[PDB]
Every structure is written in structure tokens, then in C-alpha cells.
């Protein structure tokens, strides 16, 4: 089977099919070899390849298949055809990056409750209290959660914590010493300059855009 | 990541006055790159700058000041 | 002296023993779990010779430690 | 009537994802692309490491049976077509958790196969803080790039930025492994040029990358 042509992927900025996040769409031109019955596409990280049968009208108009709900990130799509005798075209690859299924609104506000009145960006207490507003359009998506990452002065991540149903994280001094100073250097220590970034992620491939910090 | 930091602004804890010598208590520096401390007096008509080498002590003694000023 | 001395879920009752380290009571702010909080007491005057509260002057009212005292 | 809140910790992604390329002259039919390295994830209970590949649907997997923190690990790729490449590496937990992606895109070409500048460090950094430099000026040093002997000439291009991403002090440097950014070079030259006044700039970012005398440049710029 001659490989299918025009195997290209066009993102869909705003996508919804039955009120769930829709990513872009991937399209291709039917193989020129006759008797092709269906075009099978292999998707990385998926057990079941996506199969769409051709049609008697395909010889003229290229077919398209839509991909919905996958998370933002890289996808490897492999396209190959079949023959009624089982003969198969050589696979066609398309390595691309995918946008989030539903671009979510950034966190409204993100601040530290325990902040010095004398100057901004100074926590006085031993434990850093981190709070932020509930994401808007929450009722649109059933289940959501936030991913928070902590970075050092010299840019080494310290912990990636996933929080669900709560918008007020409670960083502890005991964490900062025991779980972080030792893990990052192997010796007792304290990190004074901290850094925080948070994203709002839904489940069905829904991811916020632009991070959020203070 | 690399960056530079200016010395933290100090706070003059107190000043004791002498009709020729001035004693000032000030906070301590907190930055490694600090090399010296300087002061800017104001006679009310002309601004005079004074600096003292060394940061060992928390106190200073400004000399050569106009009495009753 | 003023010491911050509890990893406490609820407001405790102020110490009754006049000892600078009170009855099983820490002398420095310990580490806490998210649920707990910190409570301090403005301890009365301490007597270094006896290393305990001078006669009288019991411990101050315990107040949850928010930020800095 | 509502989800019960919970606190969960993710898998710390492996650090120092660096593609180490081999410029060896290999036959045209099959060209051994250089290997890639990434230090083991800090969090324990990591079983293997799944890297996505541009040309392969299936991801290459390297399994960490031992426990050797600070000790690098290597995965090599051979025969891949020359061109643009994008890599995404994620760590995986013994229970089944997967870490956040670690991305690194490098364009594949025989002459483009030049390593990043190594040992890119600020010598005059303050003792207590690595991100602080005591000296009035910035004195900067770096290690000589490997495989510089075969190539007749390599000049590293150093990019300097400010608190905002502003291009300045792009220096054409040949056969020098240490650069000093003098105070006069700092405030007199570009502080006035950009800010429009003598006011100095303190926050800085540095970025160096090897360049070919006739061929193209290195795989990527070197981190501060």
C-alpha cells in the first residue's frame, strides 16, 4: 500500500464535544493503492490504535479523524493502511506537541498570608502559608486539582505537590529542612530564598496556561 | 540565577549630640559585598558627605561640625 | 524571658509551675504539623540566679503566635 | 456533597537533562547519534525512565535498579535521521506515578554535533550564597569545550541579559576560557545605553554557546 499523504495535525483553539475538552485534529489523504479498507493510526502511550474505515468517496476527498481529551504535550502519531489481503503501508510518523484540551483560566491571586508589613515578599514565621483563589469556571469541569512546584535561589526544584479541593497550602519548616535540605545536599540546612509556581489542571487533558507565582 | 545585591538600608538607632562631636548608633550590615559605610549630613544650606572606613563597630563619631547648627 | 512553646491544636491552659522550662513545656518554637498552631506566653521577669520566675508575677495570658511578637 | 480534600506529592523530575553529542565521523548509511544523560531523580522509589522520541512511537526506557544519587546515567540513540529532534523524559514511581515531563529539543546534524560549554561558573561568587558575587565586577570562567582540537577554530558567543531580557555585551571570543565583565564595561557602556542614565544594573543573566568557525554552533547554550 502506498503510504497516505498529507498526514498533518491542525490544533483546535476552542474545542468541545459533548462538554469535554477537544484537542486538535489530524488528517491524511487516502493511499493511492486500491482495495484499502481502513487506515490505522498508532498513538503513543495508547494500547488501542485509532482505526477509521475508508469510504467509496474517499478516492477524491481526504478523511480526517479527531483527537479529544489528551493532555497538553508531545504525541507520536503513526499512520499506516491495510489491504483486504492484510498488506500494510509503511508507517507514517508525525511528531508534534499538543495544546491542552481546555485552556483553563490562570489563578486569580497567589500570595503568602504570613508576609511582613514592613516590606513585601518577606515571610516572618517559621512556616510559609500559601493561599490562592479558587479557579473560576470550576463548575464547568467536575474534578480539578493544582500542581505546585518549589524552586531554590539557584533554580533546583524541591517538591512538586498536587493539591485537590483545597486552595490554602501550608508549607512547613520541618519539610524545608528534613525533606529538602538533605535531599538536595545531603546535609542539614535551611533554604531562605524560596520560589513557587502553580498551575490549575483538570483531568481530561485540561491544563492552565502561563503558570502563576508571586 | 547570578545576581548582585545592594547593602540593606540601615536604621540609625540613636544619635547623641556633642557641640563638636556626634555619636550615632546604627544597625549592622547584612551583605557580604559591603566594604564601607557613608553618611550625608545637611547643614540646612550645604550638604556635606562623610564616610568612615571599617565596619567593625556599630557606632560612629562625626567630627568637625559647626556648633549650634 | 519570652518563649514560644507549643505545637498545639487548641489553646492550652497557662503554666502553673514557676520554672523557666515549664512543666513539660518547651523553651523554643518547635516544628508543627499543618493542623496544629503555635502559642506563646509573655513570661514574667526571670531570675537568673534561681533560673525561675521571681516570686509572684505568674505567666502571661497564652496567645496564639501569629508572625512575630 | 463535595470531594474530600487531600495532599499528594508528585515525582521529582530528573535533573540535568543534557544531550551529550558525539561528533565522530560515522558512515553515511548508519550514523551513531550522540547519547543523552540525565541525573537520577531525587525522590526514591523510581523504577525506570521513559523518554519520548520524535521518530519512534514507543519510548526508550532505562531502568534504575540501583540507587546512585549524583551519579549520571546514559541513554544512546543510533541511526536516527538528521533533522529536528524533540525529547520528553519522565520519571516513574514504583507504585505507578509518573513525573512531570523534562523537555529538550536539539537539531541533528554532523556539524551541529558540538557539546554545550561546560563548567560555566562564576568564580567570584560569594561564599555563603552561590547566586551572589562579591567583586565590584563580574569575573566569569568556563571549561574548554571537548573535541575542540579537531576543529581548527571555535569562538564562544556569550549572551548577557538583565532583569528584563535585554541583549547586550555580545562578545566574539576565541581561545579564551575566562571573561571579566568590568564595572566600566558594566555601567559606563550599557547602563546608560539602555536606561538612558548612569544608574547601574545589578541583576544579571549569562548565556554562552560555542560557535563553529565554518560549521554551525553547539547543541545548546550553557546555563549559569
DSSP string, D80-94: PPSSEEEEEEEEEES
CA atoms within 13 A on the CB side of D2: 8
Yes or no, beta carbons of D101 and A165 under 8 Å apart: no
B30 touches D: beta carbon within 8 Å:
no
How many whole angstroms separate alpha carbon D145 and alpha carbon D208? 11
CA atoms within 13 A on the CB side of D109: 11
- Supply angle C-alpha C10, C13, C15, rounded to 5: 135
**DSSP state at residue A173:** H
DSSP string, B10-67: P-EEEEEE-SS-EEEEE-----TT--EEEEEEE-SSSEEEEEEE---SSEEEE-S--S
Residue A64 host element (H or E): strand A63-66
Cα dist from A64 to A6, A21, A40, A68, whole Å? 11, 18, 12, 13
Which 116-155 residues of chain A touch chain B by CB within 8 A? 153-155
Q: Which three cell numbers stand for residue B35?
A: 566594604
Q: Which three cell numbers stand for residue D19?
A: 544531550
Task: Output Rg (C-alpha) for chain B, integer angstroms.
Answer: 14
DSSP string, C22-51: -TT--SS-----SS-B-EEE----EETTTT
Phi, psi of A109 (to 5 degrees): -140, 155
In D53-203, the DSSP E strands lie at 60-63, 74-75, 84-93, 102-107, 121-122, 138-141, 154-161, 168-174, 178-181
A146: left (phi over 0), alpha (psi -120 to 50) or beta: beta
> Do residues C69 and C3 make contact, with C-beta atoms less than 8 angstroms apart?
no
**DSSP state at residue D125:** B
Q: Helix, strand or coil for residue C7? A: coil
How many whole angstroms separate alpha carbon C40 and alpha carbon C29? 9
How many whole angstroms separate alpha carbon D71 and alpha carbon D39? 6
> Do residues A54 and A62 make contact, with C-beta atoms less than 8 angstroms apart?
no
Q: Which three cell numbers stand for residue A145?
A: 486539582
Is A65 buried (19+), middle (13-18) or exposed (0-12) by CB count in 10 A? middle
Cα dist from B19 to B51, B58, B66, D156, whole Å? 20, 21, 8, 63
CA dihedral defined by A117, A119, A123, A124, rounded to 10 degrees?
Answer: -60
Cα dist from D206 to A143, B3, D49, D122, D165, whole Å? 42, 10, 31, 10, 11
Is A18 buried (19+), middle (13-18) or exposed (0-12) by CB count in 10 A? exposed
Is D87 buried (19+), middle (13-18) or exposed (0-12) by CB count in 10 A? buried
CA atoms within 13 A on the CB side of B28: 5
Residue A208 pairs in a beta bridge with A104
Those residues with Cβ within 8 angstroms of residue C55's Cβ, 6 or more apart along the chain or in another chain: none
Query: Which among D57, D85, D130 is the top mutation candidate for probing chain A, defined by the most A β-carbons within 10 Å of its own β-carbon?
Result: D57
Between A97, A149, A163, which is nearest D7 by CB?
Answer: A163
Cα dist from D152 to A205, C33, D144, D213, whole Å? 50, 62, 14, 8
Task: Output Rg (C-alpha) for chain C, integer angstroms.
Answer: 12
CA distance B14 to chain D (A): 30
> Do residues D24 and D122 make contact, with C-beta atoms less than 8 angstroms apart?
no
Q: Helix, strand or coil for residue A26? A: strand
A161 touches D: beta carbon within 8 Å:
yes
Cα dist from B68 to B19, B20, B48, C8, D209, whole Å? 7, 9, 16, 59, 64
> Do residues A172 and A125 make contact, with C-beta atoms less than 8 angstroms apart?
no
How many whole angstroms separate alpha carbon C43 and alpha carbon A210? 49
CA distance D222 to chain B (A): 13
Q: Find, among D221, D200, D121, the residue nearest to B2 by Cα.
A: D121
How many whole angstroms separate alpha carbon A50 and alpha carbon A60? 22
> Do residues D115 and D21 make contact, with C-beta atoms less than 8 angstroms apart?
yes
> Do residues A162 and D10 make contact, with C-beta atoms less than 8 angstroms apart?
yes
Those residues with Cβ within 8 angstroms of residue C44's Cβ, 6 or more apart along the chain or in another chain: C53, C54, C56, C57, C58, C59, C60
CA A204 to chain centre: 9
> Do residues A211 and A198 make contact, with C-beta atoms less than 8 angstroms apart?
yes
Q: Which three cell numbers stand for residue A77?
A: 502519531
How many whole angstroms separate alpha carbon D177 and alpha carbon D156? 9
CA atoms A12, A14, A16, A22: torsion sign: positive
Q: Which three cell numbers stand for residue D173?
A: 571570543
How many whole angstroms separate alpha carbon C55 and alpha carbon D163? 59
Q: Helix, strand or coil for residue A104? A: strand
Resolution (A): 4.3
Q: Find, among A135, A195, A140, the residue nearest to A165 by Cα.
A: A135
Is D173 buried (19+), middle (13-18) or exposed (0-12) by CB count in 10 A? middle
How many whole angstroms separate alpha carbon A198 and alpha carbon A171? 14
**DSSP state at residue D130:** T
CA distance D39 to chain A (A): 13
> Do residues D208 and D159 make contact, with C-beta atoms less than 8 angstroms apart?
yes
Q: Which three cell numbers stand for residue A206?
A: 485540561
CA distance B5 to chain D (A): 7
**DSSP state at residue D190:** I
CA atoms within 13 A on the CB side of C59: 24
Between B1, B3, B32, which is nearest D134 by CB?
Answer: B32
Task: Output Rg (C-alpha) for chain D, integer angstroms.
Answer: 21
The experimental technique behind this entry is: cryo-EM
Phi, psi of A198 (to 5 degrees): -135, 140
Chains B and C touch (3+ CB pairs under 8 A): no
> Do residues A182 and D21 make contact, with C-beta atoms less than 8 angstroms apart?
no
Residue A74 pairs in a beta bridge with A97
> Do residues A94 and A79 make contact, with C-beta atoms less than 8 angstroms apart?
yes
Yes or no, beta carbons of D203 and B32 under 8 Å apart: no
CA C43 to chain centre: 7
Amino acid at each position: 500500500v502506498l503510504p497516505p499523504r498529507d498526514f498533518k495535525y491542525t490544533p483546535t483553539p476552542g474545542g468541545v464535544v459533548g462538554a469535554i475538552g477537544k484537542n486538535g485534529e489530524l488528517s491524511w489523504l487516502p493511499s493511492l493503492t486500491n482495495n484499502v479498507v481502513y487506515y490505522s493510526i498508532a498513538h503513543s502511550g495508547h494500547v488501542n490504535p485509532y482505526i477509521v474505515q475508508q469510504l467509496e468517496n474517499n478516492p477524491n476527498e481526504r478523511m480526517i479523524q479527531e483527537i479529544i481529551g489528551e493532555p497538553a504535550g508531545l504525541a507520536i502519531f503513526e499512520l499506516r493502511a491495510v489491504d483486504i489481503n492484510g498488506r500494510r503501508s509503511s508507517p507514517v510518523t508525525l511528531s508534534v506537541d499538543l495544546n491542552s484540551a481546555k485552556n483553563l483560566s490562570v489563578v486569580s491571586n497567589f500570595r503568602v498570608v504570613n508576609t511582613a508589613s514592613g516590606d513585601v515578599t518577606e515571610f516572618v514565621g517559621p512556616d510559609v502559608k500559601l493561599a490562592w483563589d479558587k479557579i473560576p469556571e470550576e463548575e464547568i469541569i467536575p474534578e480539578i486539582y493544582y500542581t505546585l512546584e518549589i524552586y531554590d535561589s539557584q533554580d533546583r526544584m524541591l517538591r512538586s505537590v498536587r493539591i485537590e479541593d483545597v486552595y490554602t497550602y501550608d508549607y512547613l519548616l520541618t519539610y524545608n529542612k528534613a525533606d529538602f535540605a538533605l535531599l538536595n545536599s545531603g546535609a542539614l540546612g535551611i533554604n531562605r530564598k524560596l520560589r513557587f509556581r502553580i498551575r490549575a489542571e483538570g483531568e481530561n487533558g485540561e491544563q492552565s496556561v502561563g503558570w502563576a507565582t508571586i | 540565577m547570578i545576581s548582585n545585591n545592594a547593602p540593606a538600608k540601615m536604621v540609625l538607632n540613636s544619635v547623641l549630640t556633642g557641640y563638636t562631636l556626634a555619636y550615632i548608633q546604627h544597625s549592622i550590615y547584612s551583605d557580604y559585598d559591603v566594604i564601607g559605610r557613608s553618611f550625608w549630613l545637611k547643614e540646612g544650606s550645604n550638604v556635606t558627605r562623610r564616610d568612615f572606613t571599617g565596619i567593625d563597630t556599630f557606632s560612629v563619631t562625626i567630627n568637625n561640625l559647626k556648633p549650634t547648627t | 524571658t519570652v518563649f514560644i512553646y507549643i505545637i498545639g491544636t487548641s489553646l492550652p491552659a497557662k503554666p502553673t509551675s514557676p520554672a523557666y522550662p515549664p512543666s513539660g513545656w518547651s523553651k523554643t518554637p518547635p516544628n508543627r504539623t499543618s493542623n496544629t498552631q503555635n502559642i506563646y506566653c509573655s513570661t514574667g521577669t526571670l531570675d537568673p540566679v534561681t533560673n525561675q520566675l521571681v516570686s509572684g508575677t505568674s505567666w502571661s495570658d497564652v496567645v496564639q503566635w501569629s508572625g512575630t511578637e
